[PDB]
Each structure stands twice: as C-alpha cells, then as structure tokens.
Design a binder for this molecule. Structure first.
Ligand SMILES: Nc1nc2c(ncn2[C@@H]2O[C@H](COP(=O)(O)OP(=O)(O)O)[C@@H](O)[C@H]2O)c(=O)[nH]1
Ligand SMILES: Nc1nc2c(ncn2[C@@H]2O[C@H](COP(=O)(O)OP(=O)(O)O)[C@@H](O)[C@H]2O)c(=O)[nH]1
Lengths: 680, 680
C-alpha cells in the first residue's frame, strides 16, 4: 500500500542492522575457528601464527555490534531544532534543552548526566530532568550578553528512550547552540568529527545569520564533513505575501529567499567537484510534519518537505556509509581467510620433508626475509623523514602566522570589539580567573584566527599522508613479490586491489577505529580525529599568545592606570607612552613567545605521524615475525613430538574449509545487500 | 453606509481641527479688539492696561494653529512597528529605520535630518534617505553586542509626506529601539514627555521580553503617561495549535498568553484607581490590516483588531485631550473678557467724577492695594520656604541613596555584569574616551538605579506643588474679596471655579506651555517636563559617582596591574590589597563625592520651584500694577486732555460688547463640540 518514506527509513535501517549482525556472527565463528585450530597447534605440527588475525577479526566483530549512525543536530536559538527532531522521530518528546543531549535507544525512559567539574555521572528521570536543565527565553538571553555557558558543570546528558528509530541504530546529538564555548566542548568531546552526518537546522525568517555563516566557516568549511541544511519553518514565507494564496507570488518570494541560501550554502554542497546542493538543502515545515504524525505516525508527509529530505539522508546512511563500512569488514575477512589459507598451503607440503631438508629450505629464504625487513626499514625512514619535514614546516607556518597576526592586530582590534567582563576580572584573584577574563574577551578573535590556520595546516598534513599511502602501495607490491618467492623456494610450486595486509592499513583502506589522524576517509567510519587534536592545540597556541601578550602589557598598563589615579600623569600623556611601551615590549618578545608556542604545534604534528608509524610498524614486523614462526614452529615439533601426518592433513584441510566457508557467507551478505539496492 | 472606524478617526480629527481653528479666529479678533481700544486709550480717557491679556490671548491663538497630536511609537526589534504604522496610516511607506524619525504632514515627500555632532540640518529625498539610513539585520545585531548607537551623528530625521491622517493633525515619532542610549536621546529631546500618547508595539511570539519589562520600569512606570500596548502578530498564535482551526483550542492558547500580558501590563492600565486595561491593550494583526488597506483604503478592518484599538485612541485624543486643551482656551478667553468687562465697568462711572473727587476715591483704596501686596508677599514666602525645604530634603535623599548604593554594590556588581569595551578604553587617550568607556560598561546599572530614585523624587516634588496649588486657591479667594472692595470703594455699587487669574496659573488649571515643571497635568498639554530635567541630572549624578569612584580606583588598580606584569606581586597577592585599597579609598571619599554630586540635584529642585515662583510672581505683580494704572491713567488725562465723556462711553461700551461677543462664539464652539459628543 501507500509506503511512507518514514517506513522506508526504518526498513532499510533494519535491513542493514541485519547484515551487520550476520557478519558479526560469521566473524566470531571465523575467529573461534582460527583460534581452536591454533591451540591444537602446539600439540600438533605447531601453530600457524594467526594471532594478529584472530585479534583483528575479534575487534571487528565487537565493533559491528556497537555499530550505530550518529547524527549531530546543530542550530541557532529558536529555529525549530526541537520541533524538527520531534517530527523526525515522530513524537512530541523535546519541549517546544540547555545542554548537549545524546538521544539513544533504551528500554526504559532514563536520563544520566556526565559532568566535568568532577562529580561522578549522576542520574535522573526525564520528568525532573526536563525542569532542572532548561532556561527561560529570558534568563537565557541574559547568559548571552556575556557569551557564557548555561551549566559549565555539565559535559553532556544522555537520554535513553523507547524510539524504534533509535532501535534500528540511530543516535542523535542535539547541540544547544552555535556559540563558541559550546562549539569547543563538542569539538573536544569528538562529536563534530565522530558522527556520520550533521543536521544544521536553519530558519526561513532568519536566512544565514551572521552567527550561522560564522560557525560554518570556523567549524565546517573545507573540513570534509557531510551536512544537510534544513531550512525550517518554510511555511511562514507565504504569510507575508500580498495574497498568501497565490502560488506564483509565493514562488517568487521563495525564489528571493532561495538565492540567499544557495549563495551561502552552495559552497558546502559539493563532493569531488560534483555539486549536490539539492540533495543536502531542504525547505521544511517541521510544525506541519509533527502535527500530522500526532494524528497517525504512519502518516504520509508529502507537502512538509520531510520526505524529500529523509530519502537523501536514508540513501547517505544506508546505501553509502553502511556499504563503505561493511565493505571493510569483507576486506578484513578476506585478509584473515588468505593468511590462513596460504599458511596451510605452505605447511602441509613441509610436513613430509624431514628436519634436515626443512632447515635447508628455511635457510634457503633467509635472504628473502631480510629483504622484507629492507622494506620495513626503507618505509619507516620515509615515514619519519615526513613527520620531521612536516612537524617543521608547519611549526614554521604557525610561528610565522602568529607573528604576522600582529601586523594586522590594530585593524582586527577594531573589527572584533573585545568586551572585558569587569566582574570576572576583579572578582577572584588567581592568575587564571584574571587571565581567563581576558581570554574570554578575545574568544571570537582567537577562534576565528585559530580556525583559519588549522584549515591550512590540515590541507598539508593531508597531502603528506596521501603520499605516504601511495608510497606504501608500491612497497606493498614489492613486499608481495618477495613474499611469493619465499613460498616458491619453500613449497617448490610457484602459486579490490590485493596488496599485503599491513599495506591495507597504511593506505587507509581498512581500520578498526571509526576515525584516524590521517586524511583516510575510506578507513573505518572515516571520522577525522586530526581536526580534534589539531584545532584544539592551535587554540591553546593563539590563546597562549594572548595569555602571553597579556602578561607582557599588564605592567605598562598598570603603570598608566596608576600614574593617572594619583596625578603623576595627565590625560593623553600616558597613552603616548602606553604605546611607546607596548610596541617596545611586543617587538621585544612576541617573536620569542610565538616560537615558544609554535613548539606545541610541533608536538601535535609529530604525534600524528608517530601514531601512523607506530601502527604501520607493528603490522609489518607482525607479518615478518609470523611468517618466520610459521616455519620455526614446524621444526620445534619435528624435533620434539611426533605428528600423524595424515591426521594433520585433515585437521589443516578442515581449518582451511571452515574459514573459507565463513568468508563466503560474509561475501554473500555483502553482495546480496548490494544487489538488493540494484533493484531499488 | 458601512462607516469604517478609520473614517471616524479622520472625521473626529477634522472636526476638532475646525473647533480649534474657529477659536483661533475669535482669539485673534478678541486680541485685535482689546488692542485697538487700548491704543485709542492715550488719546482718550487713558488705557485700561489690558496688555497682559492681549499677550496671553495672542500666544494662546498662535499655539492653537501649531496644534497637533503627537504619538510616540515604541517597540523592540522586529515586532511590527513598521508594518503596524503602515497599516495605521494605510500606506506601505516604512520599509518592511535606524534613527528616530518624526513623521509629519507635508505637501511634497521630503526628508530633512537634524544632527548633533555639529553639522547644520542637512536635507535629502526619501529615495536616497531610505538607503543611507538603515541597517541589515546582520550589521545591526553587531552594533548590539556592544550596546552602541547606529549613527550617533544624528539626533533625528523628519519626514513630510502627503498623508491625510497627518493633515488632520497627527505627528508620529517612530523610535528605532528600546536600548538605553536611544532611550536617553528621546528623553533629552523631550518626546517621552512631549506627546499625548505612547504606542508600545509588542509581539505575541515574544511576550513581555526582559528588554521590554525593563524599559517599562525605567521610563514609564508611575510617570503618569498614557500608553497603549499593541500585542502585534496576534494571528501567529494559531499556527502552532494541534489544530489551527479549532476556536476552542485557539482561545485556550490565547488565554495562556493573555494572562502573561495582564500580569505584566495591568499595572500600567489604571487611572485614579480605575482600571482600563481593555481600553489600552490590543491584540492585533498588522499584517492582515495592511493587506486589506492595500486592496482598498476605505476597507473595513474588523477581524484585525485595529478597529477596537483605533476607537479607544480616537476617544482619548479627540474626546479627552482635545476637550481639556480646548476648555483651557475658553478659560483664558473668559479671563480676558472679565478683566476687560470689569475694567470698563469701573471707568465709565469715574469719568463723571472730577480730578479731586477721583484722587479722594483712589487714596481711599490705598490700604486695600497694600493688602493685595500682602498676598503677593505672604504667598511668595511660602513658595520659597517650599523650594528650600524640598531642594534640601531631596538632596539629602540623593546623597543618602548614592552612599547606600555602596552597601549593595557587590551584589549588584554580580547581577549586572559590566562589560568594558577594551577597544574604547585604550583607543584614544582623552580623560574622557577612557572614562566614557567605563561609563558605558555601567550604563544599565546607572540607568536602573538612576531611574528608580527620580521616581521617588518626583512623587514628592509633586505633592509639594499639589500643596502650593491648594495654597494659591485660598490666597486667590481672599485676593478676590480685597479686589471686590477696591471696586466698591471706587464705584460705590458693590458688584468652573472663579478665582483670580494669577491664581488660575498657580493652580495649574491654565498654561500656555504644553508642559510644565509641576504635577499640573490639567495645564497645557499636561506634559511633565520635570521628568526630563530631573531624570537627566540624576543620571549625571549617579554617573559622576561612577566617574568619581573611577578616578578613585584607577591608582589602586594600575598598581596591582603593574605590580604583576613586572613580578613584584604574585597572583592573588595584589587582590588582598586591591580590596584593602578600594574599601580604604571609598570610605575615604564616597561620602564626600556623594555630597558634592547631590549639589546638582539641589540646583534642579531649586530650579523647578524658582520657575514657578518667577511666573506666579509676574502674574500677581502684573495684576496689582494694572489695576493701579487703570486708575492712574484716568487722572493723567483729566489733568492733561479733555475727553468727550459721552463718546468715551460708547467707545468703551462698544469695547465691552465686542469682546463679550467674541467670548460667546468661543463658548459656543466648545459647548457645541461637547454636545455633539452627547449624541455619539
Ligand atoms: N510556522 C512554523 N513554526 C515553527 C516551525 N518549527 C517551529 N516553529 C515554532 O517555533 C516554536 C518552537 O521553536 P523550537 O522548536 O522550541 O526552537 P528550538 O528549541 O531552538 O528547537 C514553536 O512554538 C512553533 O510555533 C515550523 O516549521 N513552522
Ligand atoms: N504574521 C504576522 N507577521 C507580521 C505582523 N507584523 C509584522 N509581521 C512580519 O514581520 C516582518 C516585518 O517586521 P517589521 O514590521 O519590519 O519589524 P519592525 O521594523 O521592528 O517594525 C514582515 O516580514 C512580516 O512578515 C503581523 O501582525 N502578523
């Protein structure tokens, strides 16, 4: 019958959730199989040394169960975020919320809240929670005049609720505002870079506010994020026409409005040169959608804008993000399958050969193994000569940037009009409650300048890793050759892209983490954790610069202030000096403080590349070492126990079948789910 | 036929405009008549000494032509003020205005703008003016984060336009915002106290904002002003109901909303104990009214809320303010008529008596005249012993208040969170561009505290003048008796409230100024000019207190600041001192600065009562002196010229008729206009 798109969403979601689950199943089965066989190893012809795969496959499975689509819902004050969500999840839940709220599936309506001032994760009931954590439009505009946070004792609150949408694997993060303090919090907790998509609610009666346009630039622009812009309260446009019942006039006003959003959002709706504006921007009437879902949740929403929007989001999540993520699981399973497969194909034959003939064959390949180690060294160098070059060139960029900011300060000092909270200043006394006060006053300035640079930084670190990838690809290709030989000189018989395993990780085609510190958006969930780590330290930098230029000018200021309240200095006499002193002190230290500060940025860029090196290293040594033990364990047995060669044959032939069997089920689940899409 | 209320308004207005005009006519005629006769005086039996009446009557007339109803239209950002006005005056004039705009009748669409930075009153065309003086919702919220004024080089702009409403005698003052800077400007230019009514546009989607509620308290509460609250965009309430087409549900939401406005506005809709809330608060849909007036200006507005509102405003203006004002003109005319009448009735008879018999009769009353001077002295004392007592008790009140504000400063310092504009601070250097910066930061605090006290001050000055009035009443009563005798002992034949003239002014029953410095709201237009003069000096006071406590603490601060940026003082070491110093200095000067400041408030209260004394004096001496010259001029002639006693008789009998004739026409115009209302 009339299949509403709200059904299609729940359907697809459910479907995926099944593929996800079924793979999880095979993955364990696969792990359990490689594992049992490996334990039997010592009591037989020795282990095959497949522990790295067991582990990897095990994490992969555990990841698959905890799988979920995270959506970050951003939006300014009173735009409809609340009503919007209710409409989306078909309930009148949120109150038509002054604190980051994570909405997730749960059996009972519960609400636990995590603090930051120390307090251990409390607990409450939505009934009381709704009253304890909210703000009247009055005392909320008040905590706005000072750009302060509502409850800084809270990091975020979680809300479990029986909502079928959340059941099928959806988590919602509802951000309370666009201000900068709340911004960092979200950035620091991950979110902005730990969610599959961003839902940025806007309103037709307030087209791309300065507040919005600013946020977009400081936190979204060129950061490679998927964000759908929902122009809410679209229905209001017509309640202002000469004739609110003239589709032609209406259309014309809507058009006036539409060229405004396009002008400001086009820039954010493109993917690799291709423009997808109308698959990301949606004119909506949340109030009309909600109303309809209140008379019947299986209600058709055509006319509210929702359908068109939901189908895009459905597609993105279930036919793109799921595929990519699922595909990786297949890749990991094929790796496990092959390593096992080949390992066995190498052993069975060596089982017949005698200890002497064996060590002769093993020594035969010693030169090949060392070559592998040549790659492990040749690539490690390059890896490090890249961190060094990068951690240098960037530190330079920052140092140079901070300094040069001083050449424009005057003009900027005017554009931004730092407001100093006189109460915050005096109030306490800690050499922090006084510096924070000044730090706040320069919040917008710090954020802006700060966000701009890290964009530039990231654009480079990206390319770096993009090269290292291409590099690993080739080293991987040769590594394989050297590997093929080790098999031939051992066995006698010479046996997606099929590069080695460690190569798969180094290229960012695979990964067990949702995110990583390189530009690998095809790895894991794709999440860019270097926007966190980077655009956080940089703030400490550009802020320290202030925290520094602060202690630099206090003295000169205090002098002027003091030399006036006593009468030693007259009006405008101290100002021809405060300056004389300022300029003097700055040109006397700024360059040093810049340099001193650009040393934190150094450690951050060095870190990015040290994580990568640390991992790629593990995996490569891990390969080398296992292939070698593969051979050593045999000898350790031929000289110690006595194996029944034919029973070993079945046991290992069995191992091989059982694993492949599992891989196929997975390969199927994937193919089927894909094919289903071929016909829909 | 279907007479729309927009017609009734234009009608009534027109009608009044006629009565007003006709009286103006008779007034001149009356003045011209007393004048011609007076010139003939020297060549005849001498002047009657009616110059005070000629003058008074002449001003009264000139005032009558320049007559107009002034409306102050207040309102927050984006509430509908603009759309509202357009709907009111049936045009799509204002742009759906970042500067006080005075909208008045004019032949050609013109726009002159008066500055304050010096520039001489420029000039423009609405075409260009519309573009040169406006602000995008963007760069307008920007000049909001710092609570600054858009164009401080402008005081206001006037806009002449061919609008029949303005023709019939209506002026509109459209205020751009509720902020405090714009507030003072309006207060300083008069407006808030130089307009017959205030139109405070509010919006249903933003019920009594903090911004609004604050304004109301600081500028309207207990100030005796007439303000109509227009709850605009009332239509929007239903676009949020489960079912927007359920009058019952609607009504219930409206009710939820209605108890909010009543709770906050009731307080402002009462007159002498009587509550008239629903004659002042009006739920409106400006957008629907405008639309209808675009298809036809003679359009019925029933259903928009406008009709109900307009009729109240019509009533207030044309059947209350006009009456009161017109009635005064009648009072002034009766005074002129009587003074003339009686003067003549005293002379004709003395014309027969011979010089000797005359001086005998004149000397006969010398004791009576001195008695009159006894009143002129007995009342002048009291007048002055009242200014002294008041200018003292108030100065005390202020001094005491300023000091005591210090006992609560800490708590207040928290409530208000003074933001200091770091740019403004440093920037220049004048011992003003630095103090202003600090003055601004404390704007809200100064305004609030300041406005509160002057309310208290006014409540007293009122009573003072209310007493002086009652006092004058009685002195007037006796003055009359003494006057009656002077006539009897002279003539032989013993000849609204009918107190003497000077008594009429002292009681505030009459006045040639729209406003005055006493609580006389029955005098002139009623305007309270002591809310201007008073609530302006007080700001200079509570602000100077700051400007003072500023220079008091600079030194201690500068010391702490300086003793930190050099390392002589550690963190939280200087703060146990900044305080040590603060408290020390304040308790060491505040009391003196308070006292020094409470000396401006002294001059303001002394002024109020000196204006009153100055005037009441003039009028009383003026009476005494004329009545005396009345007698002297006769003698000056009986001894110098020779008059034809019978011709003088006709000339003066004529004078008498001609004046009375004019008074009657006026007495009629008034009575008729009133009676017309008796039947409508
Ligand atoms: N006409 C219309 N009004 C809306 C729409 N969405 C929300 N509103 C109105 O805005 C109010 C709710 O704002 P809200 O959702 O709480 O803002 P939020 O808390 O920032 O998400 C309600 O009273 C609605 O009347 C919409 O799509 N169309
Ligand atoms: N629904 C509704 N909208 C209104 C009403 N009055 C004004 N508006 C809307 O508010 C906007 C105009 O705001 P405006 O009058 O310029 O605010 P102002 O400049 O502060 O007076 C228009 O786009 C209208 O759609 C009203 O009575 N009802």
């Amino acid at each position: 019958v009339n299949q509403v798109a709200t059904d299609r969403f729940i359907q697809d979601l459910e479907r995926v959730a099944q593929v996800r689950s079924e793979m999880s199943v095979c993955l364990n089965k696969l792990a359990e199989t490689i594992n049992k066989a490996e334990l039997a190893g010592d009591s037989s012809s020795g282990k095959l040394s497949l522990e790295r795969d067991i582990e990897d496959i095990t994490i992969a499975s555990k990841n698959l169960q905890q799988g979920v689509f995270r959506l970050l819902v951003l939006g300014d004050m009173k735009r409809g975020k609340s009503t919007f969500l209710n409409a989306l999840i078909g309930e009148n839940l949120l109150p038509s919320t002054a604190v980051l709220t994570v909405l997730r599936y749960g059996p009972e309506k519960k609400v636990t809240i995590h603090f930051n001032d120390g307090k251990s994760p409390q607990q409450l009931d939505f009934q009381n929670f709704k009253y304890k954590y909210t703000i009247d439009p009055a005392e909320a505009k008040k905590l706005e005049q000072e750009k302060k946070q509502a409850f800084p004792d809270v990091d975020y609150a979680v809300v479990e609720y029986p909502l079928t949408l959340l059941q099928k694997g959806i988590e919602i993060v509802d951000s309370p505002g666009l201000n900068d303090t709340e911004a960092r919090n979200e950035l620091s907790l991950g979110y902005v870079n730990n969610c599959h998509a961003i839902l940025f609610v806007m309103r037709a009666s307030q087209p791309c506010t300065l507040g919005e346009r600013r946020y977009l630039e400081n936190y979204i622009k060129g950061r490679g994020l998927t964000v759908f812009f929902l122009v809410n309260a679209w229905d209001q446009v017509r309640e202002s026409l000469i004739d609110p019942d003239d589709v032609e006039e209406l259309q014309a006003s809507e058009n006036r409005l539409r060229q405004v959003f396009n002008a400001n959002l086009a820039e954010y709706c493109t993917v690799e040169g291709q423009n997808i504006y109308d698959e990301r921007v949606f004119e909506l009437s949340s109030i009309q959608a909600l109303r309809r879902r209140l008379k019947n949740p299986q209600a058709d929403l055509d006319g509210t804008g929702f359908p068109k929007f939901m189908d895009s989001l459905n597609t993105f999540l279930t036919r793109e993000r799921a595929i990519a993520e699922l595909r990786q699981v297949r890749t990991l399973a094929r790796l496990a399958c092959n390593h096992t497969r080949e390992a066995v194909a190498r052993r069975i034959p060596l089982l017949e050969q005698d200890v002497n003939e064996l060590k002769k064959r093993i020594d035969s390949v010693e030169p090949e193994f060392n070559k592998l180690t040549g790659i492990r060294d040749e690539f490690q160098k390059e890896i490090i000569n890249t961190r060094d070059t990068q951690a240098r060139t960037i530190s330079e960029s920052f140092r140079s940037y901070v300094l040069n900011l001083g050449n424009t300060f005057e003009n900027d000092f005017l554009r931004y009009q730092p407001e100093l909270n006189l109460f915050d200043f005096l109030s306490s006394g800690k050499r922090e409650a006084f510096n924070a006060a000044l730090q706040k006053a320069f919040e917008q300035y710090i954020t802006d300048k700060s966000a701009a640079w890290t964009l530039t930084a990231e654009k480079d670190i990206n390319a770096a890793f993009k090269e290292l990838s291409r590099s690993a690809s080739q080293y991987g290709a040769s590594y394989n050759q050297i590997t093929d030989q080790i098999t031939e000189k051992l066995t006698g018989k010479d046996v997606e892209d099929n590069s080695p395993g460690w190569a798969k990780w180094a290229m960012g085609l695979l990964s067990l983490s949702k995110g990583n510190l390189a530009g690998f958006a095809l790895a894991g969930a794709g999440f860019d954790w270097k926007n966190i780590l980077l655009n956080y330290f940089t703030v400490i930098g550009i802020g320290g610069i202030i925290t520094a230029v602060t202690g630099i000018l206090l003295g000169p200021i205090g002098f002027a202030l003091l030399g006036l309240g006593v009468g030693f200095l007259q009006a405008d006499q101290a100002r021809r000096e405060l300056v004389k002193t300022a300029k003097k002190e700055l040109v006397k230290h700024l360059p040093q403080v810049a340099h001193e500060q650009s040393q934190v940025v150094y450690n951050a860029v060095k870190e990015c590349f040290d994580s990568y090196e640390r991992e790629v290293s593990k995996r490569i040594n891990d390969d080398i070492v296992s292939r070698k033990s593969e051979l050593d364990n045999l000898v350790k047995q031929k000289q110690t126990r006595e194996i029944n060669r034919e029973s070993e044959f079945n046991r290992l032939k069995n191992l091989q079948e059982d694993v492949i069997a599992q891989l196929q089920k997975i390969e199927a689940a994937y193919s089927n789910l894909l094919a289903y899409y071929s016909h829909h």
